[PDB]
Symmetry: C3
Subunit: 432 residues, 3 copies
């Protein structure tokens, strides 16, 4: 039952990549992934399964292998019954093949092959999930220069499968897409765009279990990822100490070479694609790294995996844990402030927040910031420094002094007349 | 597994009311309720079941209907076995009829009818619950001008039933009563009083699984509900990020037309009926609304339902979520404070609180309040403003300045000599 | 499902002691323990089981009794299957006898006896636990003046048993040892040393499910237990509101006569034996008290038991609950500070902490402390009092004023020139 993924890795100098971590009925973590000796298309990809036992990743079981065919990404995860699903596209044919296991990785059975039909290919990718009576494996497809996002579905526990809901069909090459039931009909999705270049991930939402979809635009935070290459998004659902739900997005930035997460209030995500929080690095991701996946414990505790290259032809799985702390129920942008002014922030909360923090920085993208508390200094006349705070059932209001921060009276960081700032930026956080 | 009830409703222009929301073994939420085309006694009430699937409340299954009889409130919920129980009083006969389902709302079986005996009637109402080996459906009864609160019990998983524990018997018409196992023998109860007029809900407690009961008096907070009509209380159990248990009370105020909750530390509730916190509105409740019920996830996350009228003859179920945030382990009343004084608050905590907030208002029923932090102003002489704080293993102590709040140095809310307050009110909150 | 252990006790004027509390499949708490009419070796110890039902500890079932033999400590707990295990050393023979129950305390079956072999004895003690496919009962042994810590293991669900991993073998009489899977191969252990005198408990860790062990030294906090008698340690695993794992250590101090807990970040515990937090008393422990054990709910909520003497020949089980609050993700020692200085604290956190508290005391072992916020006073010239704070992704930095705390302007606790402190101690806490 408890887990510890800090520092854990599966690495045997293969090219192990493109897979999913999930958890077995018996609480054991496992990985299903493509094991190969190259990444190039038409190389030696086989679908394999490894279980984490005693802190050691097991010698992998072969799920599916065919000379001379090349299995690509491995999609799947654990169904409600405890059956495991693994699905992978055969590079040579564009067909998706689906395997299941009822003994938890020991034996595998081929259940289904999806033919291309008129499509150039169907590409299986990502964590599979339950939607009502249906279990879903996400696919992306191209047909010349039309592109589609689709679900491959089973309503009988994996015995039979079929093309189902269609999420997108258009001229934009959306591909690797993570879907998160959030639920009672609501499904959120975040998609890689083409090569990933451009600094954007696309956000879609359905309110009817995949029946219909709205394109909500690009995932948007105050401080983005420039035009960086962004790939393989993955999503998790958590809720706070008092029941507030948030969505957590992991993604890999191949320009800065880091895997990051950001969060958003589910309420905001339902409303649109803006309101995501600041990026937090959870792992270095050199070169062609990572392809994240998560298991969540206690509605609170994210266990993660990505893949990382040690060279252009070798890679392994590296696990980690995400420590979210207490996610604010309300959080402002960094916003500009001036002296002797009044700032009024609608908090949008079900009750007045019992806790509030106000912080100060000299830009809206700071690397350091100060806690704002109402002080005083004297420069010839009497002056307040910082902010007083009023809380109520609608608003947080801030009243700034002659300086919005700083006094000159405190060592190192506030030790001269020059640290008395008449202007800058505040950020307000509030917790119910 | 995840749920989202924000904005959800079951409304088909019937008079749907007086029911319970609970959760099925498979994680599906459901409602059992009285569906009719009127509210008046002797109209067309039938007991019905609806399941929430894909974000859509299902066309209801008929649980029990009889021309020309009128089923009234629907009590019940999910037993430990996954069997569902629905019970309702027949208006014409005063008899309670009990139905169960073993396939989760699809089929229903009549298990029991309770005859009046010497009582004018037995009235089934509320969420049923497990007490040790017993499953309980709450009843209220009248016999002329004697009134009783009783439990209808089964010790064989719902196969057979019988009158059990008697909670109250006297001249006061206590009726709609919610019971919450809190547990190892401790059961809390909160009861509507007569019509509900008077602004009071009555609190009872047993320490022996219903064997004996103590009347603890009226539910009491610092700021009550005047003489308002208070109806249909319902209770939930949660525990904080570090294991502190609280009880959450939902109720409908038909004078202000809002459904509210308040909370109390379980430790306080065991000790008596005072110590409840401030009311928080979770839903408008026009006219003859609501009849709340809850499901709790992760010890933390309350999912709720009430019924609301759209007219005197039409009503629906409306769901919501409660965001408790981090409930304080210690919380004072608003209490009066003066300048240059020392306030000593026994926190009652198992260890010194790691976090403390002090807030200030000009009345003990404020709509806005300020965060108290030790500042300074000069009005001819040197003066502290606000409070310094000492924490220890017994007490929080506050030392007030020449002003208990205010300086005149901060925009909007603290911008004149007039905002330098020598007196007012403080509230202290503390979190372990 | 909910539990309430506040004030609960099992006491019948026997000498009831040396046992374990755990929880049954059906959510019922139970105790397995030695019931006797004396504590002396060779008296009348029998292994017994009691279940908590309706808030009342049941008349105990006899698990194992033999005239004229004396069962000593009772080790065990609940296996993953729901089978209960109870094991106890027979004083006269030094043999360990193992019993199981498949009906949850009603019937017991003897499964195994461990002969001494060359050992003076094997002594069963503590909460048993699962390690992968193995279930473990801890033993300590002596062979003249060699001492060993060992695991008695079953890999078939308790049907057969055998000596397994050896944790320690040497000249130091480590004995009562608690083991906590933390997991994926990581097991922490804390051990009583000999009689317990000396103020120390010893910390060991394995990273390979008991294959190998490292002695990490004495459990170390800033403020220890002098040379006190420390006995019967026991360990629990919890995780914070955002997934940060901590270990909680309970132990009994027979010099001060209190049962205490301390906590440590799992990350710190893996790194070594220092970093434990301050002791918190959870129960008086007169004379030869207590022998703690815990059940944890929701990753958050510790339910506890110890045994307490009412005289040299009578004792009972007393239960309690531990309220951890929000455990800091980072916490400094009390460290010395001076005026007009800059303190730089590496927080070690995955992201910048959203919340920080700074407190002040005049020693590094204070009984009271003050919250530090940047104020002002004038003693002829302008002076800051307290500290300003900078937060970033690596460090918390504090800048102190001319006084590190105090102004003379606030009633009771800060009301004279004498409370303007140029030096003292700060403690910083941070929560992600």
């Amino acid at each position: 039952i408890p887990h510890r993924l800090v520092g854990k890795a599966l690495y045997e100098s293969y090219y192990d990549h493109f897979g999913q971590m999930d958890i077995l009925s018996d609480g054991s973590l496992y990985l299903i992934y493509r094991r190969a000796t190259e990444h190039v298309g038409g190389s030696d990809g086989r679908v394999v399964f490894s279980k984490l036992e005693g802190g050691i990743w097991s010698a992998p079981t072969i799920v599916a292998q065919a000379g001379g065919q090349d299995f690509r990404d491995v999609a799947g995860g654990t169904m409600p019954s405890g059956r495991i699903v693994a699905a992978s596209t055969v590079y040579e044919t564009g067909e998706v093949k689906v395997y299941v296991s009822d003994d938890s990785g020991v034996t595998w059975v081929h259940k289904f092959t999806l033919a291309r039909g008129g499509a150039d290919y169907n590409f299986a990718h990502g964590k599979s999930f339950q939607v009502g009576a249906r279990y879903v494996i996400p696919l992306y497809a191209a047909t010349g220069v039309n592109y589609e996002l689709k679900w491959l579905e089973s309503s009988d526990g994996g015995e039979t499968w079929g093309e189902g809901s269609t999420i997108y069909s258009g001229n934009t090459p959306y591909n690797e897409t993570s879907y998160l039931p959030v639920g009672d009909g609501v499904i959120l999705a975040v998609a890689r765009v083409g090569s990933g270049a451009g600094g954007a991930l696309r956000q879609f939402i359905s309110l009817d279990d995949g029946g219909t979809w709205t394109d909500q635009g690009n995932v948007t935070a105050q401080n983005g990822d420039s035009t960086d290459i962004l790939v393989a998004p993955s999503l998790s659902y958590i809720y706070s100490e008092g029941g507030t739900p948030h969505v957590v997005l992991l993604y890999t930035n191949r320009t800065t070479h880091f895997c990051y997460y950001r969060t958003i209030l589910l309420a905001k995500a339902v409303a649109g694609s803006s309101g995501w929080t600041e990026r937090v690095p959870v792992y270095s991701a050199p070169a062609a790294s990572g392809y994240t996946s998560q298991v969540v414990l206690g509605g609170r505790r994210i266990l993660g995996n990505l893949f990382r290259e040690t060279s252009s032809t070798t890679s392994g799985a590296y696990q980690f844990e995400v420590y979210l702390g207490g996610v604010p129920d309300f959080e402002s942008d960094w916003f500009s402030v001036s002296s002797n002014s009044l700032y009024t922030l609608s908090h949008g909360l079900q009750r007045s927040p019992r806790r509030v923090v106000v912080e100060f920085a000299r830009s809206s993208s700071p690397s350091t910031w100060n806690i704002v508390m109402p002080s005083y200094f004297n420069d010839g006349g009497h002056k307040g420094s910082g902010a007083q705070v009023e809380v109520g059932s609608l608003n947080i209001r801030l009243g700034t002094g002659a300086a919005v921060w700083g006094t000159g009276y405190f060592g190192g960081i506030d030790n001269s007349a020059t640290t008395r700032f008449a202007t800058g930026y505040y950020r307000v956080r509030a917790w119910i």
